[PDB]
Design a protein around this ligand. Structure first.
Ligand SMILES: CCCCCCCCCCCCCCCCCC(=O)OC[C@H](COP(=O)([O-])OCC(O)COP(=O)([O-])OC[C@@H](COC(=O)CCCCCCCCCCCCCCCCC)OC(=O)CCCCCCCCCCCCCCCCC)OC(=O)CCCCCCCCCCCCCCCCC
Ligand SMILES: CCCCCCCCCCCCCCCCCC(=O)OCC(COC(=O)CCCCCCCCCCCCCCCCC)OC(=O)CCCCCCCCCCCCCCCCC
Ligand code: HEA
Ligand code: HEA
Ligand SMILES: CCCCC/C=C\C/C=C\C/C=C\C/C=C\CCCC(=O)O[C@H](COC(=O)CCCCCCCCCCCCCCCCC)COP(=O)(O)OCCN
Ligand SMILES: CCCCC/C=C/C/C=C\CCCCCCCC(=O)O[C@H](COC(=O)CCCCCCCCCCCCCCC)COP(=O)(O)OCC[N+](C)(C)C
Ligand SMILES: CCCCCC/C=C\CCCCCCCCCC(=O)O[C@H](COC(=O)CCCCCCCCCCCCCCC)COP(=O)(O)OC[C@@H](O)CO
Ligand SMILES: CCCCCC/C=C\CCCCCCCCCC(=O)O[C@H](COC(=O)CCCCCCCCCCCCCCC)COP(=O)(O)OC[C@@H](O)CO
Ligand SMILES: CCCCCC/C=C\CCCCCCCCCC(=O)O[C@H](COC(=O)CCCCCCCCCCCCCCC)COP(=O)(O)OC[C@@H](O)CO
Ligand SMILES: CCCCCCCCCCO[C@@H]1O[C@H](CO)[C@@H](O[C@H]2O[C@H](CO)[C@@H](O)[C@H](O)[C@H]2O)[C@H](O)[C@H]1O
Ligand SMILES: C[C@H](CCC(=O)O)[C@H]1CC[C@H]2[C@@H]3[C@H](O)C[C@@H]4C[C@H](O)CC[C@]4(C)[C@H]3C[C@H](O)[C@]12C
Ligand SMILES: C[C@H](CCC(=O)O)[C@H]1CC[C@H]2[C@@H]3[C@H](O)C[C@@H]4C[C@H](O)CC[C@]4(C)[C@H]3C[C@H](O)[C@]12C
Ligand code: CUA
Ligand SMILES: [O-][O-]
Ligand SMILES: [Cu+2]
Ligand SMILES: [Mg+2]
Ligand code: NA
Ligand SMILES: [Zn+2]
Lengths: 227, 94, 84, 58, 259, 514, 105, 48
């Protein structure tokens, strides 16, 4: 989850999210460098009483400041697209889970074997147990096996929603009539939080997502008990 | 087939359209449709700038293909020079 | 293509009148014959209350709310089937 | 039909200071008044309708 | 007094009455759709027609009767009409995109096929082919009208322009009959939606274009056009060819390929 | 006379003035809505109500700022005032149609205000996506009034585009080619081409939403075989060109301001600037699905849209470097307009660069629908488009009015606004990277510090807006009349005096061919 | 585009034209100061003597001021230029801006 | 001396360090003593 005064991304919980962190570090360095260069050059242009107001020939220097940005863009696009196609690669999941968005909560279906499904609603602020997080906890968490490739399928039974979990690098829109797929793999046990990420009406801010990542044998027994 | 009955512009153009038409036929351009062609622009052979008043704005494209046009009021009297290239212009009021 | 016709020399009013009466209106006449010749009602199919058809998410702003604007009782079933 | 454009040209070029939308004669003023009255009255009516629609009606 | 060739237009009320007619038509549609009443809408449609009539009347006064359409002014009006037609093309492009989006990827609700289960399309070789011949023919006859006008031939201009209008009206009547006879409706899923909204806006433009041709017909009867100056006729002809080409795309896309 | 002049106008300057007044009033509305947003978010918990009232405010904020403030001010206001003067033309091509482009906007605005007064308002986002905006989840008149508001604004701008393109192509001196017209005129021509092509597609999409809501069509409704995502394509096919429409006249004014207060007779690299604006205009039509990287599109389509979007940095970089090269060697005049333009160059660059971050579809999965997007577009809108509007307003106010502003007050105003907007939006990058979603009325507790700071920033910007009103009042109250303006040889719009006469260029300029 | 010496010689020739008129004096000086250089004393000398032929003492002083201005923060250029011009200043009776108190703000 | 609004189309005076010799003199009208001064300026400036 996010923590107070956080500046950057939530710590990565999945290898893909780790890849995104390093790619963001690379891109932000370039962003910093170019912004700072432009600010510096502005100050340089403005700090001399020397003048030169006659016509200036442009041809030579426009080569520099076309070719240099083109090279920089290529230096961004290459790692960007590598991660894109990595995130797309075939992986062979062990488990498929569906989630359906609704106004205003998520339901989950685990129907590889038995017909397991339940609804997952925000815990009202007045009912939080001590130490629980305002607007983030749910009554029924999305229990999942850690260290395993999971296929998430996402849809909606009413308006648009979007199913997100920032620390896993996931955001898949929930569209009625459409079954969108993403894959999820947590390197660690724990609790990982997300929030509805497409405006969906009166309680858009109040339909969060909580994944609970545990060893397979715990997930199996939990699954059985949820039937 | 064939036959007539459609008026011509000669017959039926009126107002400013007709003035422009009749002037063009005489080779004249009172409504500034054409670009004037430059003289050599010396003080001896200044560009001659018609006006219906005693001043008119000139735009000077000093060199072929300059994208910057140099604009100034030209007043009745002694020829004036473009402030960028010095080419001469003289107002001819009428 | 050059089509298969032939003239020019000058494209003029006479040529375009020639095309109008010699090609364009004869073609309209032919298609008018073809059409008013294949008219004659088709059998209306069995009514099936498919959920992707006869959509009603809001009543229409005319009539009883349930009839389309150029409703033809012979061939346009209502959501409950053919009327009357 | 005969070509009466010349007499229309005389009428609409008469030096009377009228704008072109009134230069045909009294019929122009009537049609203008009808148009503007419908527009301004209809606009006031639309504002009443907004007033009506802005509140719940049992 | 000016020494350029452009038109300084007298101060005019029609921009304001046109803008207000747009307010009345849109608030009128809202009232019709949500408050079961046509009153505002009928006022808006009326003031809209009044505005268009007086505005274009004044343009005729300014040009035919007052002589303000110099060649430079006409050239601006040519660009204006071409740009207007371009915006109309892009408007139709949105509906063709909707049609291809839905028909190339038919969803499970349709049966996963195009045409959808339960849709029985019109035969594109019957009235739709007839309406294609009708608009193509009108494109030939309006070209005859144009050449007759340029050659100074009043009678054959009027004959050809009358034939063009008659064909425009024929198309509209055929299309109205096909709308009544069609066994599917605008509420028949995305097939009906795309069919009737796209051909419906096209039919509206045929009516607009026919009205514009009729205006030209009565102006021609009153000798407004010269053999060299007749931009209103040229504009109505360009608009008419645009209506014909949109029909050809509809016929190939929706009636034929989409059947 | 008053009605003839101000309701029946066929004069490009008076119609420009009408647009500037309309846009200034809209700007107050938009500012109030922005303060309501930030009041709701300025402490954790709920201030106003749930997300419906909150997102009616957000939705209106955006529509007002975009369609009633920026576009009327830049295109209707500076465009009508300056374009005919900069080409020596005696008015616009269609001076009477021009007046209708203006008068469609008060009705469009009335329709938007009506949408928020009836039922529970249109709480949809300015993107108006179905099915939230459809007749089940937004039953009643509000969304239809919004659609009609957009229809009228769209007609206004399409007819305005026709006017500007025709005027700029057809009404220059016969010797002046397109490559002798000023960059602001180019910027308006290209913006008008974008308006002409993109707005009809928006009109098509929102008409389909209207018929899905009222005539039982199903363009966007799966039950009929429709698709919500089709709406998104049609909307963004307009919506990406629209953001270039919002900035391009700003680029044009920045070129004139930087050139003028550098003491230069011309911008550096004129044909490069023309090339860059045309390139940006063209590329802005082939990138729209970067608004759709999380909707489930195939990976090769995501790779194409990532790459095509990033290319626009190259022409845009040529413009930024050319502005810097215009400053180079200048006799710099530190006028208030120059300060706006310098702040523009830097802060626009920052927002353009976070836009390049977002163009990477892999990273956009995590940034999409978060405040990192909000930060990107307020750097280019609140510190780009707005800074160009303020710079142009302070630079050309003496031309339009004949009176001078107090330059010390104008510099104070710039200083306050600069602090305010940066305090508002810079922390929103942190909120975005750390996962705060868009269109939320309340947030998990961890996000409190940056939301508090951001809201405090928005109040500083409010103080700047109030001070702007006083500064305009003080200028009209004191009546310091303009005497001499420098550099008129390369700024033709000043050469008829301040304010210019009602009719200018009744006798056209003389320009020979040589 | 040319050698420095060719540039300076063109400018000396320009100002040395015997019947140079007031417009050409101003055009010359206002064009020259647009370049990225402080004009060589030999150019300034020719401009000052043009001022003399045009009976314009004030413009001669102004030309010395614009030499100082074009040097910017390089405070060594203007005293060097004046040093090089002192024979001409004395011959023509041209007082410097400093001698006239015109360097006071 | 006094600049007027109705003078906007005439060459004007400006103080700009990059336009050292403006298009007009700051003062156009001369008193008797100022006329005598301009005459004296035609003689050696060493005598001023
Ligand atoms: C109520 C509306 C009011 C309209 C104004 C009426 C003013 C009457 C004043 C009479 C004096 C000079 O010559 C003139 C000729 C006028 C021709 C009018 C054509 C009317 C439309 C007919 C359309 C039929 C099209 C259908 C094709 C398919 C048919 C299917 C059956 C002069 O006159 C020039 C004036 C006309 C120029 C501007 C015309 C703009 C016309 C459009 C406004 C109306 C829109 C209707 C279109 C929508 C579909 C009906 C004198 C003419 C008066 C009659 C004008 C009727 C216009 C309608
Ligand atoms: C426009 C900066 C803070 C930072 O370390 O950000 C780091 C990253 C995330 O990094 C991490 O994951 C590790 C964080 C390290 C923690 C160390 C503690 C830092 C102390 C707390 C900082 C207080 C923040 C100030 C709060 C600021 C409130 C306003 O966040 C971000 O990317 C924020 C993304 C910003 C992208 C816009 C770039 C604009 C550049 C303009 C500068 C040019 C010249 C400046 C000079 C500008 C002069 C005009
Ligand atoms: C003035 C308005 C404006 C402008 C000009 C831009 C310009 C750009 N925008 Fe922006 N954008 C918006 C307004 C604007 N945007 C809005 C309103 C939204 C949100 C819509 C909504 O959902 O409500 C948005 C959303 C948006 C998204 C969607 C993100 C998401 O929703 O998840 C993306 C993704 O690619 C994007 C990218 C860019 C890019 C690459 C540019 C480029 O044009 C920027 C190019 C500029 C530079 C790069 C800086 C100058 C260049 C140099 C100094 C050269 C060297 C630089 C490099 C080598 C990189 N924008
Ligand atoms: C031009 C566009 C523009 C501008 C200028 C602004 C300015 C501001 N915006 Fe907004 N904003 C949007 C367009 C804009 N915004 C859009 C498109 C959205 C997305 C909507 C959606 O999600 O659907 C958005 C969303 C948005 C949000 C996110 C809401 C959410 O996700 O829940 C927030 C929150 O802080 C915000 C705040 C502000 C603030 C505090 C300002 C302040 O900086 C405003 C300060 C005041 C000014 C800048 C004055 C403006 C007035 C003038 C310039 C008149 C000048 C007068 C003369 C020239 C005479 N905006
Ligand atoms: C040639 C013969 C036909 C000619 C054209 C006839 C009508 C054209 C009217 C306008 C067309 C514009 C689109 C309106 C949308 C739908 C009309 C589609 C065409 C039509 O007429 O569709 C009819 C339905 O009309 C209906 O719902 C309701 C029809 C009336 C309601 C119109 C609602 C207002 C539409 C809003 C317009 C917004 C425009 C914005 C433009 C902005 C541009 C910048 C089909 O009838 P049906 O009974 O369903 O099936 C036949 C069964 N036998
Ligand atoms: C991210 C990409 C960054 C690109 C930066 C490129 C900087 C180029 C700088 C050096 C050019 C010399 C002599 C004739 C007159 C002078 C004409 C050219 C003036 C110099 C150019 C002005 C450059 C100002 C800085 C722009 C970066
Ligand atoms: C480059 C443009 C290419 C356009 C057409 C691509 C067609 C691809 C389908 C091929 C046959 C199978 C499907 C694509 O659907 C679709 O509608 C595509 C609909 C067209 C969208 C085109 C965008 C441009 C719109 C303005 C012109 C999923
Ligand atoms: C909704 C209801 C729509 C109802 C129907 C409207 C039908 C349109 C009628 C237009 C009539 C215009 C008559 C004025 C005219 O045609 O004016 C001409 C100028 O053209 C001009 O302005 C050309 C100007 C007109 C362009 C009009 C194009 C159609 C616009 C229709 C609205 C679009 C709706 C879109 C809906 C999605 C006059 O110049 P000339 O002809 O050279 O004459 C001069 C000679 O006589 C001198 O010798
Ligand atoms: C949901 C319902 C929403 C409804 C919204 C409706 C809103 C608008 C109400 C419209 C009222 C229209 C009244 C008639 C306007 C005629 C304009 C015209 O004809 O403008 C002409 C220029 O535009 C030209 O040519 C070429 C351009 C002609 C355009 C004609 C009008 C088009 C209006 C609709 C445009 C829709 C665009 C659709 C495509 C997306 C003439 O320009 P003027 O400056 O007048 O004169 C110049 C003088 O020299 C002439 O002698
Ligand atoms: C200017 C913006 C206008 C917004 C328009 C909203 C639509 C209003 C139409 C409603 O009109 C009302 O309907 C009532 C029940 O039928 C009754 C009443 O007498 C009538 O007035
Ligand atoms: C040829 C054309 C106009 C030149 C003129 O007629 O004045 C110029 C103007 C801007 C130029 C372009 C811009 O300077 C940007 C690019 C700069 C690179 O150095 C070459 C390609 C590059 C894409 C240039 C190609 C070409 O020289 C352009 C397109
Ligand atoms: C996004 C749009 C489909 C819109 C729709 O669903 O209605 C589709 C239609 C045609 C597509 C393009 C064409 O298929 C051609 C290219 C194919 C490449 O694999 C991706 C880029 C590429 C350039 C495509 C991008 C995108 O998928 C496009 C533009
Ligand atoms: Cu569900 Cu937002
Ligand atoms: O839109 O960026
Ligand atoms: Cu975009
Ligand atoms: Mg989203
Ligand atoms: Na809150
Ligand atoms: Zn010149």
């Amino acid at each position: 989850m996010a923590y107070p005064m956080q500046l950057g991304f939530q710590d990565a919980t999945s290898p893909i999210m780790e890849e995104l962190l390093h790619f963001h570090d690379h891109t932000l360095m370039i962003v910093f460098l170019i912004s700072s260069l432009v600010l510096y050059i502005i100050s340089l242009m403005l700090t001399t009483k020397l003048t030169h107001t006659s016509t200036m020939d442009a041809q030579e220097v426009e080569t520099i400041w076309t070719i240099l940005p083109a090279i920089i863009l290529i230096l961004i696009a290459l790692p960007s697209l590598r991660i894109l196609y990595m995130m797309d690669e075939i992986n062979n999941p062990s488990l498929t889970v569906k989630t359906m968005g609704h106004q205003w909560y998520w339901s989950y279906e685990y129907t590889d074997y038995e017909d397991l499904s339940f609804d997952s609603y925000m815990i009202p602020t007045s009912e939080l147990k001590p130490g629980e997080l305002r607007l983030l906890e749910v009554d029924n968490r999305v229990v999942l096996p850690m260290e395993m490739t999971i296929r998430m399928l996402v849809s909606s039974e009413d308006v648009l929603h979007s199913w997100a979990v920032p620390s896993l690098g996931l955001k898949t829109d929930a569209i009625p009539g459409r079954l969108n797929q993403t894959t999820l793999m947590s390197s660690r046990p724990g609790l990982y939080y997300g929030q509805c990420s497409e405006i969906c009406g009166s309680n858009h801010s109040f339909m969060p997502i909580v994944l609970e990542l545990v060893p397979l044998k715990y997930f199996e027994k939990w699954s059985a008990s949820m039937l | 087939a064939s036959g007539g009955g459609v008026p011509t512009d000669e017959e039926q153009a009126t107002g400013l359209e007709r003035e422009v038409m009749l002037a063009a036929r005489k080779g004249q351009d009172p409504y500034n449709i054409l670009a004037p062609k430059a003289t050599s622009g010396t003080k001896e052979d200044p560009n001659l700038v018609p006006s219906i008043t005693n001043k008119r704005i000139v735009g000077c494209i000093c060199e072929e293909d300059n994208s910057t046009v140099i604009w100034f009021w030209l007043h009745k009297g002694e020829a004036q020079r473009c402030p960028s290239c010095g080419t001469h212009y003289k107002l001819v009021p009428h | 293509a050059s089509a298969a016709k032939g003239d020019h020399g000058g494209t003029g009013a006479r040529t375009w009148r020639f095309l109008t009466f010699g090609l364009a209106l004869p073609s309209v006449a032919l298609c008018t014959l073809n059409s008013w010749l294949h008219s004659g009602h088709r059998e209306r199919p069995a009514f099936i209350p498919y959920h992707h058809l006869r959509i009603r998410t809001k009543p229409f702003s005319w009539g009883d709310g349930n009839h389309t604007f150029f409703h033809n009782p012979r061939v346009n079933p209502l959501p409950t089937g053919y009327e009357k | 039909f005969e070509n009466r454009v010349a007499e229309k040209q005389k009428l609409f070029q008469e030096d009377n200071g009228l704008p072109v939308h009134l230069k045909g004669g009294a019929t122009d003023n009537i049609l203008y008044r009808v148009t503007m009255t419908l527009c301004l009255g209809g606009t006031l009516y639309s504002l009443y309708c907004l007033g009506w629609a802005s509140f719940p009606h049992k | 007094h000016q020494t350029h060739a452009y038109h300084m237009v007298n101060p005019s009320p029609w921009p304001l009455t046109g803008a207000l007619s747009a307010l009345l038509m849109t608030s009128g549609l809202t009232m019709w759709f949500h408050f079961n009443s046509m009153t505002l809408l009928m006022i808006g449609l009326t003031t809209n027609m009044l505005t268009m009539y007086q505005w274009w009347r004044d343009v005729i006064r300014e040009s035919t009767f007052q002589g303000h359409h110099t060649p430079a002014v006409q050239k601006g009006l040519r660009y204006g009409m071409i740009l207007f037609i371009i915006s109309e093309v892009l408007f139709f492009t949105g509906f063709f995109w909707a049609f291809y989006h839905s028909s190339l990827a038919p969803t499970p609700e349709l049966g996963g096929c195009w045409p959808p289960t339960g849709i029985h399309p019109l035969n594109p070789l019957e009235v739709p082919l007839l309406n294609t011949s009708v608009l193509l023919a009108s494109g030939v006859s309006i070209t005859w009208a144009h050449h007759s006008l340029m050659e100074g031939d009043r009678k054959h201009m009027l004959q050809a322009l009358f034939i063009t209008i008659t064909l425009g009206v024929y198309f509209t009547l055929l299309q109205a009959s096909e709308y009544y006879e069609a066994p599917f409706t605008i509420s028949d899923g995305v097939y009906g939606s795309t069919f009737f909204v796209a051909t419906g806006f096209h039919g509206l433009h045929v009516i607009i274009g026919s009205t514009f041709l009729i205006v030209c017909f009565f102006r021609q009867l009153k000798f407004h056009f010269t053999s060299n100056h007749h931009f209103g006729f040229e504009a109505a002809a360009w608009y008419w060819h645009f209506v014909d080409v949109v029909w050809l795309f509809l016929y190939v896309s929706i009636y034929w390929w989409g059947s | 006379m008053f009605i003839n002049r101000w309701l029946f106008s066929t004069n490009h300057k008076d119609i420009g003035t009408l647009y500037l007044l309309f846009g200034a009033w809209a700007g107050m509305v938009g500012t109030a809505l922005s303060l309501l947003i930030r009041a709701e978010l300025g402490q954790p918990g709920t201030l106003l109500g749930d997300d419906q009232i909150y997102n009616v405010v957000v939705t209106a904020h955006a529509f007002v700022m975009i369609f009633f403030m920026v576009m009327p001010i830049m295109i209707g206001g500076f465009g009508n005032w300056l374009v005919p003067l900069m080409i020596g033309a005696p008015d616009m091509a269609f001076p009477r149609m021009n007046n209708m482009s203006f008068w469609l906007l008060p009705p469009s605005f009335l329709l938007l205000l009506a949408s928020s007064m009836v039922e529970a308002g249109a709480g949809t986002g300015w993107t108006v996506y179905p099915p939230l905006a459809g007749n089940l989840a937004h039953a009643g008149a509000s969304v239809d009034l919004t659609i009609f508001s957009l229809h009228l604004a769209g007609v206004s701008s399409i007819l305005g585009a026709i006017n500007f393109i025709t005027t700029i192509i057809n009404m220059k001196p016969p010797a002046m080619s397109q490559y002798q017209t000023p960059l602001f005129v180019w910027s308006v021509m290209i913006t008008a081409v974008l308006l002409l092509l993109s707005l009809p597609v928006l009109a098509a999409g929102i008409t389909m939403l209207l018929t899905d809501r009222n005539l039982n069509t199903t363009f966007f409704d799966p039950a009929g075989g429709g698709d919500p995502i089709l709406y998104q394509h049609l909307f963004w096919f307009f919506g990406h060109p629209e953001v270039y429409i919002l900035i391009l006249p700003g680029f044009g004014m920045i070129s004139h301001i930087v050139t003028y207060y550098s003491g230069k007779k011309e911008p550096f690299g004129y044909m490069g600037m023309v090339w860059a604006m045309m390139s940006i205009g063209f590329l802005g039509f082939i990138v729209w699905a970067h608004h759709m990287f999380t909707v489930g599109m195939d990976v090769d389509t995501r790779a194409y849209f990532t790459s095509a979007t990033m290319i626009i940095a190259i022409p845009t970089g040529v413009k930024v470097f050319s502005w810097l090269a215009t400053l180079h060697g200048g006799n710099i005049k530190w006028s208030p307009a120059m300060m706006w333009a310098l702040g523009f160059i830097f802060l626009f660059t920052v927002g353009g660069l976070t836009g390049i971050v977002l163009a990477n579809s892999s990273l956009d999965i995590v940034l999409h629908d978060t405040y990192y997007v909000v930060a990107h577009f307020h750097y280019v809108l609140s510190m780009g488009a707005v800074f160009a509007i303020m710079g142009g307003f302070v630079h050309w106010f003496p031309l339009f009015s004949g009176y001078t502003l107090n330059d010390t007050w104008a510099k104070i105003h710039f200083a306050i606004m600069f602090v305010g907007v940066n305090m508002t939006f810079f922390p929103q990058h942190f909120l975005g990277l750390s996962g705060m979603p868009r269109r939320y009325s309340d947030y998990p507790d961890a996000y409190t510090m940056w939301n508090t700071i951001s809201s405090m920033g928005s109040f500083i910007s409010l103080t700047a807006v109030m001070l702007m009103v006083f500064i305009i009042w003080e200028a009209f109250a004191s009546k310091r009349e303009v005497l001499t303006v420098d550099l008129t040889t390369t700024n033709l719009e000043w050469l008829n005096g301040c304010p210019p006469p009602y009719h200018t260029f009744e006798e056209p300029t003389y320009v020979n061919l040589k | 585009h040319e050698t420095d010496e060719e540039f300076d010689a063109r400018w000396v020739t320009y100002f040395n034209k015997p019947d140079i008129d007031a417009w050409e004096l101003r055009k010359g000086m206002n064009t020259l100061v647009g370049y990225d250089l402080v004009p060589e004393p030999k150019i300034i000398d020719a401009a000052l003597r043009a001022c003399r032929r045009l009976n314009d003492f004030a413009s001669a002083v102004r030309i010395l001021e614009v030499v100082k201005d074009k040097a910017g923060p390089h405070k060594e250029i203007y005293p060097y230029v004046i040093q090089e011009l002192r024979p001409t200043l004395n011959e023509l009776g041209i007082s410097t801006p400093e001698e006239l108190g015109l360097d006071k703000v | 001396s006094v600049v007027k609004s109705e003078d906007y189309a005439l060459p004007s005076y400006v103080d700009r360090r990059d336009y050292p010799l403006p298009d007009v003199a700051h003062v156009k009208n001369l008193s008797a003593s100022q006329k005598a001064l301009k005459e004296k300026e035609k003689a050696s400036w060493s005598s001023l």
